[PDB]
Amino acid sequence: SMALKRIHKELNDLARDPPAQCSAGPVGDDMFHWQATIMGPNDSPYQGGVFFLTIHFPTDYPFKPPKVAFTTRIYHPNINSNGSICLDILRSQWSPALTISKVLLSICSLLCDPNPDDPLVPEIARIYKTDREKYNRIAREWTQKYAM
């Protein structure tokens, strides 16, 4: 299928052009189910943590977006305790030109710069907007407790 060839191409590109501090690929022989790893961006409050994700490609990838879930607990306005990620390119702004590499880089950018106006966790969005210093404090503590 076209999905399987696209997934294989993305995997080879990932191997040859390793993203900035991220990893992703099939665990086992099911090519439509991947695991991914993100190291907390430096200068973000998540620095030093490592965050695990699962990725499920639909059968008509790349014409529908991958489904991505955050497995690791994290304090972030756009990621909730079901692991859902409020990220526009995973939903309305998905385009077949996008890749897992691009998705993982966009997630890293979102960790550095949350979008508090489209919250998944309203109280974290409120702390982020109203008291960045305490937000950063707590995000660091949760990184130490749950992502290390």
From Swiss-Prot:
Function noted in UniProt: Accepts ubiquitin from the E1 complex and catalyzes its covalent attachment to other proteins. Catalyzes 'Lys-48'-linked polyubiquitination. Mediates the selective degradation of short-lived and abnormal proteins. Functions in the E6/E6-AP-induced ubiquitination of p53/TP53. Mediates ubiquitination of PEX5 and SQSTM1 and autoubiquitination of STUB1 and TRAF6.
Gene Ontology cellular component list: cytosol; extracellular exosome; nucleoplasm; nucleus; protein-containing complex
Name of the featured protein: Ubiquitin-conjugating enzyme E2 D2
Organism the protein comes from: Homo sapiens
Keyword field: ATP-binding, Nucleotide-binding, Transferase, Ubl conjugation pathway
Catalysed reactions, as listed in the record: S-ubiquitinyl-[E1 ubiquitin-activating enzyme]-L-cysteine + [E2 ubiquitin-conjugating enzyme]-L-cysteine = [E1 ubiquitin-activating enzyme]-L-cysteine + S-ubiquitinyl-[E2 ubiquitin-conjugating enzyme]-L-cysteine; S-ubiquitinyl-[E1 ubiquitin-activating enzyme]-L-cysteine + [acceptor protein]-L-lysine = [E1 ubiquitin-activating enzyme]-L-cysteine + N(6)-monoubiquitinyl-[acceptor protein]-L-lysine
Pathway where it operates: Protein modification; protein ubiquitination
One Pfam family it belongs to: UQ_con
